[PDB]
């Protein structure tokens, strides 16, 4: 990392304190930039979804994996649920998305409540596996909310065989009143749905797949209990990457867990965290970890700074740990504190190979939480922290241990009133990163790290320019 | 105190300007940390209650002393009141708490007004020294407010002999409709009450006791008048520690008072303040003081900064005075400016041996003030400063001196709507300090001071993370 | 009652629907009007305080009785409390008022909380029965709230022997900084206090006294249980008038209770209610009642109209019952619905001999409730209904009976920010009644009833003129 | 119900789980539920089962719909229109 001449502050820096200076560039178009990562995770975009119960669902897993990202399943998830989620994710199609399925005997209220599980805007009515109609938000309005969806479903919709080129589907949907194309299997059953923006993204994004050509997925494990057995079970379940997560990664228990997991020779990339120092990164890498997760404090659901005073600004910790890992040949992930695409761009320019996003993705349709409405009826969801699931651990002892346990924080994440979907957030993030690469003059992320020039700004410098629209920021 | 490389600001630092960097740790559990102090005060927790008339009552004294802290009685308190308070505090039980006692002829309104003097949630009806029923807030609702409590008291409650193991009381209260166990003396009179959380805290906390096994208590004295006689009277009254308090401790009058008190050889630890410089600390220690109180300006009720410009940020003053006192073999207390547990953690990491908390504890049930309700009916109390009681001092001369006297400031401290009690604040503070010790890797406070690494952050760094719930901050 | 020509509405009328037409008058001054009643109650003003626990205290009893009114003690009050209240009321002085007494060891907060029990604005510090100083609201401001009142009491105050002519006390207080004159007994003990307005009222108002020259007081009894024994006990306790009160007075149980009470020949006036019909009034009078209480529904704490639909506008019920009672030689009291002095004036013009006022007097200093402050810090108190105490009546049967029992309503009554006292409300009411008498041309209440001419107005008619200041209306 | 009320008098949760003789779940009863069972009388048919009514419009074949509703077990028929 190269800083401007004389920019040597006497304090640690956050994302708001730094800026990127443009350089001489030959990359003109954003599409000339390669966003693939080199840390062995297999993602084609630098976006990773945090192992939080409020974001890491199966719908989010499928949606993020199709666009090139990866989702880490939260720790302490039962192995049966892990197996079911992995099977569902790996049974999905690489291009066609899974729609919301409704029965003709469902009520209008149930249809309107299930319509918001995806970002397609419409659901397919299925009778014996075959599509027979579409249900939209407009059709549910102005009717009895306990009427059957059979009386409101429209029987005319665009249909194409599965495997059709996305441009043909786009041309077919160019003149359709509903921007949903129902793709069917050769026998006639429902294969899925494809929208116009879905076709555009299928032409823009590359899915993150394994050796067998199926969508990738990761799983997280804690350091309590028998870490080796849990890691072996998760590897057998089909996880493509293992994360050993704890609040304070620089301790003997985490080193023992890393050694125990590495001694099994599972053949999967190993991620450990979290540390904010170079010594902790070196210890984690020497223990056997391939990737080090960096960040203690900047989590949006984290109250460690206010309760203990322990923490560190994320930018300085990321640059230090990235320098240490590069000196040891490892890689670092930047976890926590991401609100804008500029945060992802600065984390990538700081030397990180991947950025992990948590509560920001909670305000989407694909997140497992329930959709709620505030005073102004603006859509929002609720994000909450993992709390004691990230900590080291009769009814008397349970109460005694819980008296000092970290509480579960809670925040409201507003959905974008115009888009709402997580793929739009991915579009914003990737557009910002590509524009950063074009401004710096880099064709890929390593060149972005090697060519970037950074400077320090005051509080008045951060207020320059125009803010982002609502829903584009956490 | 060790700072990060290059973190040498050109200004003095407050608690908001600094953070603690995690290090390699072997302490995994919070309960493995020893929070006892080494300054000779006798406290098992680093919390000290300020000598303010708005906080330092007898209920607060008992409650804090039972949990390992100590309360300093405010100066200029009449010696008879001092003796009564000391006798009441030293006559209390080490495990069982003192309940609110009601007569069966009392009105419902009086019972509902007395219910908020403790944090038990219920009061005991006493007839000739024997408990006959319990009164709760639910029973007082929906009835005539001038009806007798005999008509609303419930006659069925859990009863156990005094001296019973707290776990047995917890098991008995596991299935009780009211979480209050009435502990009685062998003859049958009322010994006190014990709750489930009370048993948990009795199993977690260690009472601060003297050589005779009775709860400790301290007293404060000013530098006006005959300081020696007042100190001797306070020592004879039963005070376990003496505090010589004034607004400007670095002056000749304070040195004379310290010498006069030390010449009596009372055998008690001597605390003097306040100073914010190393030279003042050295002068106070050489004068005869064993502990030096540090802080001029950060008091929540103090208007010195706005009236005179005299003051100093608390963190830098604390580190400097702690270094000076350690170089002279003394100890320092950090007085004023504490709003969050992180403030206590940073004060302990700065080199202080004890933290004195004032207005924050005013927003509790145990404080001597009256409970009030704001617009939203949220509970709160009123905190105010000592004013001329901390300063050096016919109707014409009284008015002449009072024309320039410092006024009494006033603020509203909101109670935690879910807890309200001071023991919950103590739980939060101790949990934060233990988590800080685990993050640093220290088994006790001296190791916390010796192993801590600190860094400087900007205003954007302090905004990282999630804020604390309501009532957890001053 | 004579109405204007053609004013024969097809509905029942409230106080807001009627107005008084002025006639030829010879009474010019308000002081020429005689406000004494002729119903045998003994009141020199037509104001009676309702038998409600929120208004009928001993302070209110003394204050109202001194000015010519009477207070009815609430039913179900224990006989010991009745005896104590009667003794306190009958031990008072006819001119000098009872002050708030403070000990020199009391705190400033206790003094400031006790200052609002009376309307004098100051309290007397008493040491061994002798006054030694005065404490006012101004002295309590700007000092430590836990300081003793000895340090704030002023030792210079106007003192006069008891029995002094009120005009001399007024002349002495003409030049006093504090408008409180401490009247002392010949031995030197505290006899009481007298203000300037107190002397004016002693020169204007005539106390309501019994045959022995002591302040009068009444008591109320329900129709449940042994009514005869309770009435005998209340008569022996010293009550000057008995009220048999129930929600529905026109029923067999009330008639039986009236007969049982009348068979004892106690020699006291008997009041029964409530009825809103002429037949009920005739039945109550024939049963043995001398005075009939009229009103079912208009009570400010009464929810009968909204729960059952049972009720009647108060003006029509009062005129009908007054006509019936006059035809039988009895008298009627108008109970409930009084918010303005015009309501009292119209009730007296409607034929009633006394007006019973409830919740309106709850917003005074003398009421037994505690003084509270709203958002704007405006003083107010809480009024509530008697509920089941006005109705006919194991833990299973108690719950079964309480499931259908009437709940306790609650309202906020704002105090007059400039006066606050109940004597000011009495002044407003008496001034309004005297002005009504002067407008009609009557020298007394019977002439007011015989000479009054009434008319009916629409909703627009009631909106004419200027509203009353804050605190002058319920 | 009075026995259930006495049992729930000292329970931390005011819900009594009533079970069938075999041990399966029959239902729940609260204190206020027992009070109401002692106060209110259930509306039952000739067989001692809870009553229920049904409504029918005036469009279509009203007779057939009414006959079907009567066969379904409705205890009272409502012919409703604006
Ligand atoms: N057995 C389980 N135990 C604990 N948490 C679970 C379990 N199964 C799922 N979860 C959690 O519940 C959340 C919802 O996950 P997921 O979306 O797979 O559930 P679902 O309700 O089956 O899905 P959908 O929203 O499509 O109906 C996730 O945070 C997941 O980790
Ligand atoms: N004689 C006194 N002179 C001045 N201040 C006093 C005196 N006695 C007590 N105080 C102060 O009054 C406050 C209340 O103290 P404390 O709680 O002991 O009083 P209390 O009213 O007897 O107690 P409780 O609240 O349990 O009824 C404290 O700030 C104390 O310093
Ligand atoms: N033993 C009792 N049982 C029930 N109610 C009572 C009893 N004693 C008093 N009350 C009620 O309590 C209220 C206050 O009575 P009290 O005589 O104290 O009046 P007060 O004027 O407020 O006097 P104080 O100077 O004591 O404040 C009244 O409504 C009265 O009926
Ligand atoms: N200390 C703490 N960290 C949390 C909690 N929940 C999530 N985190 C951290 O915060 C990250 C998410 O950051 P975010 O994107 O929400 O700001 C997670 O990946 C995890 O590292 C919690 O309850 N406590
Ligand atoms: N100058 C000044 N300091 C005060 C006053 N009241 C309390 N203090 C100081 O502030 C400390 C309490 O700090 P707090 O916890 O209220 O912020 C006390 O221990 C004392 O040192 C006051 O009126 N004036
Ligand atoms: N039904 C009913 N009447 C009440 C209640 N409390 C007071 N009252 C009636 O209302 C009268 C007071 O009228 P107010 O002056 O409050 O409008 C009382 O004298 C009594 O007759 C109550 O709870 N229920």
Q: Long-range contacts of range D52-58, CB-CB < 8 Å, 24 or more positions apart? A: D53/D77, D53/D78, D54/D78, D55/D79, D55/D80, D56/D80, D57/D81
The residue written with tokens 């350089």 in the block is A23
The span from the CA of D80 to the CA of D72, in Å, is: 19
* Distance from the alpha carbon of residue A261 to the mean position of ligand 4, in angstroms: 23
- CA angle, B326 then B329 then B331, to 5°: 65
Beta pairing class for B158-161 and B181-184? parallel
Upper half-sphere CA count for residue C474 (Cβ side, 13 Å): 22
Instruction: From chain C, pick out residues whose CB is under 8 angstroms from the CB of B81.
Output: none
Q: Are C336 and C356 in contact (CB under 8 A)?
A: yes
The span from the CA of B238 to the CA of C243, in Å, is: 61
Whether D13 and chain B come into contact, CB under 8 Å, resolves to: no
Indicate the helix (H) or strand (E) that contains B231.
Answer: helix B227-237
Give the chain B residue nearest C370 (alpha carbons): B109
Q: Are B459 and A294 in contact (CB under 8 A)?
A: no
Q: Are B250 and B280 in contact (CB under 8 A)?
A: yes
Torsion angle of the four alpha carbons B199, B204, B207, B212, in this order, in degrees rounded to the nearest 10: 90
CA separation, residue A114 to residues A135, A147, A370, B116, D68 (Å): 11, 15, 10, 48, 34
- CA angle, C415 then C356 then C346, to 5°: 95
Tokens of A373: 């409405």
3-state secondary structure of A367: coil
Interface A:B, ≥3 CB–CB pairs < 8 Å? yes
Tokens of A342: 């500029």
Starting at the edge strand found earlier in the chain, the sheet holding B18-20 runs: B2-3, B453-456, B18-20
Start-to-end C-alpha separation, chain A: 27
Residue B8 CB burial class (10 angstroms; 0-12, 13-18, ≥19): exposed
The span from the CA of B64 to the CA of B116, in Å, is: 17
The residue contributing the CA closest to ligand 2 atom 27 is: B368
Torsion angle of the four alpha carbons D8, D9, D11, D17, in this order, in degrees rounded to the nearest 10: 0
The span from the CA of A50 to the CA of A70, in Å, is: 9
Task: Assess whether the C-beta atom of C296 lies below 6 angstroms from ligand 6.
Answer: no
Residue A148 pairs with which residues in a beta bridge? A107
* CA-wise closest residue to A185 among A251, A234, A138, A126: A126
Which of B134, B138, B177 best probes binding to D when mutated, by most D CB atoms within 10 angstroms? B177
CA separation, residue A458 to residues A13, A439, A464 (Å): 11, 22, 11
3-state helix, strand, coil in chain B (%, to 5): 35, 20, 45
Q: Are B356 and B334 in contact (CB under 8 A)?
A: yes
Starting at the edge strand found earlier in the chain, the sheet holding B101-102 runs: B101-102, B122-127, B130-136
The span from the CA of C201 to the CA of C215, in Å, is: 16
The span from the CA of B387 to the CA of C301, in Å, is: 48
Upper half-sphere CA count for residue C415 (Cβ side, 13 Å): 26
Alpha helices per DSSP H over B384-455 = 395-403, 422-440, 445-451
Q: Are C311 and C304 in contact (CB under 8 A)?
A: yes
Alpha helices per DSSP H over B250-376 = 252-262, 278-287, 304-308, 314-328, 341-349
Number of Cβ within a 10 Å radius of residue C231: 23
B146, B370, B389 member nearest C368 (Cβ): B146
B345, B440, B465 member nearest A303 (Cβ): B465
Rg (CA), chain C: 23
* CA-wise closest residue to B66 among B34, B100, B98: B98
Tokens of B168: 């047995």
* CA-wise closest residue to C220 among C387, C330, C77: C77
3-state helix, strand, coil in chain D (%, to 5): 35, 20, 45
* CA-wise closest residue to B29 among B447, B446, B439: B439
Task: Assess whether the C-beta atom of A251 lies below 6 angstroms from ligand 1.
Answer: no
Tell which atom from ligand 2 comes closest to the C-alpha of B60.
Answer: 17
Cis bond upstream, residue C296 (ω within 30):
no
Number of residues that make up chain D = 82
Beta strand ranges found along A276-317 (DSSP E): 291-294
Torsion angle of the four alpha carbons B77, B78, B81, B82, in this order, in degrees rounded to the nearest 10: 60
The span from the CA of C244 to the CA of A81, in Å, is: 74
Q: Are A301 and A385 in contact (CB under 8 A)?
A: yes
State the helix-helix crossing angle for B227-237 and B252-262, rounded to 10 degrees: 50
The span from the CA of D75 to the CA of D82, in Å, is: 23
Q: Are A200 and A179 in contact (CB under 8 A)?
A: no
Tokens of A67: 């666009």
The residue contributing the CA closest to ligand 5 atom 2 is: B302
Which of C396, C401, C403, C405 best probes binding to D when mutated, by most D CB atoms within 10 angstroms? C396
The span from the CA of C451 to the CA of B361, in Å, is: 69
Instruction: From chain C, pick out residues whose CB is under 8 angstroms from the CB of B375.
Output: 375
From which experimental method does this structure derive? cryo-EM
Number of Cβ within a 10 Å radius of residue B66: 26
The span from the CA of C44 to the CA of A197, in Å, is: 90
The residue written with tokens 């959380």 in the block is B197
CA separation, residue A106 to residues A114, A147, A157 (Å): 11, 8, 20
3-state secondary structure of C35: coil
Task: Assess whether the C-beta atom of C53 lies below 6 angstroms from ligand 3.
Answer: yes
Upper half-sphere CA count for residue B333 (Cβ side, 13 Å): 32
Task: Assess whether the C-beta atom of A58 lies below 6 angstroms from ligand 1.
Answer: yes
Whether B8 and chain A come into contact, CB under 8 Å, resolves to: yes
The span from the CA of A299 to the CA of B466, in Å, is: 7
- CA angle, B33 then B37 then B40, to 5°: 160
Tokens of A7: 């920019």
The residue written with tokens 């600390």 in the block is B281
* Distance from the alpha carbon of residue C71 to the mean position of ligand 3, in angstroms: 13
Torsion angle of the four alpha carbons B230, B231, B233, B236, in this order, in degrees rounded to the nearest 10: 170
Query: Phi and psi (nearest 5°) for B159?
Result: -130, 140
DSSP assignment of C391-419: S---HHHHHHHHHTSPP--EEEEEPPSS-
CA separation, residue A242 to residues A40, A214, A235, A355, C392 (Å): 12, 17, 8, 16, 75
Q: Are A47 and A64 in contact (CB under 8 A)?
A: yes
Residues making up the binding site of A for NADP(+) = 245-247, 295-297
Number of Cβ within a 10 Å radius of residue B326: 14
CA separation, residue B286 to residues A162, B221, B258, B334 (Å): 89, 19, 10, 20
DSSP assignment of C90-136: HTS-SSSBPPPEE-TTSBHHHHHHHGGGSSSSEEEEEETTEEEEEEE
Q: Are B366 and B345 in contact (CB under 8 A)?
A: no
Rg (CA), chain D: 20
Number of Cβ within a 10 Å radius of residue B383: 24
Q: List CB contacts of B382: < 8 A, sequence separation 6 or more.
A: B54, B362, B369, B370, B372, B410, B411, B412, B413
The span from the CA of C295 to the CA of C291, in Å, is: 13
Beta pairing class for C122-127 and C101-102? parallel
The span from the CA of A217 to the CA of B446, in Å, is: 46
The structure was resolved to a resolution in Å of 2.5
CA separation, residue A188 to residues A128, A133, A166, A191, B294 (Å): 11, 14, 19, 9, 81
The span from the CA of A85 to the CA of A79, in Å, is: 10
Residue C253 CB burial class (10 angstroms; 0-12, 13-18, ≥19): middle
Residue B335 pairs with which residues in a beta bridge? B356
Query: Phi and psi (nearest 5°) for C3?
Result: -105, 165
* Distance from the alpha carbon of residue A297 to the mean position of ligand 4, in angstroms: 8
Query: Phi and psi (nearest 5°) for C351?
Result: 115, -5
* Cross-chain residue pair D2–C395, CB shorter than 8 Å: no
**Residue to mutate, B77, B237, B383, ligand 2, most ligand atoms under 8 Å from C-beta:** B77
The span from the CA of A277 to the CA of A248, in Å, is: 11
Report how far Cα B26 is from the mean position of its chain's Cα atoms.
31
* Distance from the alpha carbon of residue C85 to the mean position of ligand 3, in angstroms: 9
Q: What phi-psi label fits residue A419: left (phi over 0), alpha (psi between -120 and 50 degrees) or beta?
A: alpha
Rounded to a whole number of angstroms, the distance from the CA of D1 to the nearest CA of chain B is: 21
Task: Assess whether the C-beta atom of B294 lies below 6 angstroms from ligand 5.
Answer: no
Tokens of B452: 């801590």
C53, C145, C146 member nearest B144 (Cβ): C53
**Residue to mutate, B73, B343, B385, B389, ligand 5, most ligand atoms under 8 Å from C-beta:** B385
User: DSSP label at B468?
Assistant: P
Q: Are B207 and B13 in contact (CB under 8 A)?
A: no
Tokens of B62: 């008992």
- CA angle, C39 then C44 then C47, to 5°: 80
* CA-wise closest residue to A36 among A444, A460, A450: A444
Task: Assess whether the C-beta atom of B355 lies below 6 angstroms from ligand 5.
Answer: no
The span from the CA of A359 to the CA of B434, in Å, is: 27
Question: Which ligand sits nearest to residue B338's alpha carbon?
Answer: 5
The span from the CA of A208 to the CA of B139, in Å, is: 63
Give the chain B residue nearest D13 (alpha carbons): B177
* CA-wise closest residue to B455 among B321, B346, B317: B346
* Cross-chain residue pair B384–C145, CB shorter than 8 Å: yes
The span from the CA of A434 to the CA of A35, in Å, is: 8
The span from the CA of C323 to the CA of C332, in Å, is: 9
Task: Assess whether the C-beta atom of A369 lies below 6 angstroms from ligand 1.
Answer: no
Task: Assess whether the C-beta atom of C357 lies below 6 angstroms from ligand 6.
Answer: yes
Whether C384 and chain B come into contact, CB under 8 Å, resolves to: yes
User: DSSP label at C268?
Assistant: S
Question: Which ligand sits nearest to residue C110's alpha carbon?
Answer: 2
Q: Are A292 and B39 in contact (CB under 8 A)?
A: no
The residue contributing the CA closest to ligand 2 atom 10 is: C146
Q: Which chains touch C (3 or more CB pairs under 8 A)?
A: B, D
Question: Which ligand sits nearest to residue A243's alpha carbon?
Answer: 4
The span from the CA of C219 to the CA of C208, in Å, is: 15
Whether B384 and chain C come into contact, CB under 8 Å, resolves to: yes
* Distance from the alpha carbon of residue C368 to the mean position of ligand 3, in angstroms: 7
Start-to-end C-alpha separation, chain D: 44
* Cross-chain residue pair D12–B156, CB shorter than 8 Å: no
* Distance from the alpha carbon of residue A133 to the mean position of ligand 1, in angstroms: 28
Give the chain B residue nearest D14 (alpha carbons): B177
Of chain D residues 21-60, which have a CB less than 8 A from chain C?
Answer: 31-32, 34-36, 38-39
Torsion angle of the four alpha carbons A186, A188, A190, A194, in this order, in degrees rounded to the nearest 10: 60
The span from the CA of C433 to the CA of C45, in Å, is: 10
Is the CA virtual torsion A338, A344, A347, A353 positive or negative?
Answer: positive
Tokens of C106: 């009391």
């Amino acid at each position: 990392v190269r800083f401007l001449d004389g920019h040597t502050p006497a304090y640690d820096l956050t994302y708001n304190d730094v800026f990127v200076v443009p350089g001489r560039s030959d990359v003109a178009s954003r599409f000339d930039v390669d966003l693939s990562t080199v840390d062995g995770s297999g993602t084609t975009i630098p976006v990773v979804v945090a192992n939080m119960t409020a974001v890491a669902g199966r719908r989010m897993a499928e949606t993020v994996a199709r666009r090139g990202g990866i989702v880490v399943l939260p720790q302490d998830l039962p192995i049966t649920a892990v197996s079911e989620t992995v099977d569902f994710v790996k049974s999905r199609d690489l291009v066609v998305d899974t729609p919301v399925t409704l029965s003709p005997e469902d009520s209008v209220s149930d249809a309107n409540a299930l319509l918001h599980k995806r970002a397609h805007g419409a659901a397919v009515v299925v009778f014996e596996g075959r599509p027979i109609g579409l249900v939209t938000e407009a059709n549910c309005a102005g009717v009895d909310r306990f009427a059957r969806v059979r009386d409101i479903a429209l029987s005319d919709f665009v249909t194409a065989p599965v495997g059709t080129d996305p441009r043909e589907v786009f041309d077919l949907l160019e003149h359709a009143p509903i921007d949903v194309a129902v793709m069917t299997a050769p026998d006639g059953t429902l294969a899925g749905v494809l929208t116009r923006t879905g076709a555009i993204r299928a032409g823009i994004y590359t899915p993150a797949v394994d050796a067998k050509g199926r969508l990738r997925i990761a799983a997280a494990v804690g350091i309590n209990g028998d870490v080796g057995a849990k890691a072996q079970a998760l590897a057998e379940a089909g996880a493509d990457l293992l994360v050993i997560d704890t609040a304070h990664g620089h301790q003997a228990k985490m080193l023992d867990a890393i050694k125990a997991v590495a001694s099994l020779d599972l053949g999967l990339p190993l991620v450990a965290g979290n540390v904010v120092s170079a010594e902790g990164t070196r210890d984690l890498i020497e223990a056997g970890a391939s990737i080090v997760k960096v960040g203690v404090g900047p989590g949006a659901m984290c109250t460690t700074r206010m309760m203990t005073g322990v923490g560190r600004p994320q930018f300085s910790a990321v640059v230090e740990c990235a320098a240490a890992a590069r000196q040891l040949g490892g890689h670092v992930w930047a976890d926590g504190g991401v609100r804008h695409p500029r945060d992802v761009a600065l984390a990538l320019a700081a030397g990180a190979s991947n950025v992990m996003i948590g509560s920001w993705f909670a305000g989407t349709y694909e997140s497992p939480g329930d959709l709620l409405f505030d005073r102004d009826d603006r859509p929002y969801k609720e994000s909450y922290g993992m709390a004691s699931k990230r900590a080291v651990a009769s009814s008397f002892d349970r109460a005694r241990k819980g008296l000092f346990e970290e509480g579960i924080s809670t925040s409201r994440m507003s959905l974008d009133p115009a888009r709402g979907g997580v793929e739009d957030l991915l579009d914003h993030i990737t557009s910002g990163v590509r524009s950063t690469c074009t401004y710096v003059g880099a064709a890929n992320l390593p060149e972005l790290h090697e060519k970037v020039v950074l400077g320090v700004q005051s509080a008045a410098g951060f207020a320059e320019g125009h803010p982002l629209p609502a829903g584009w920021t956490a």
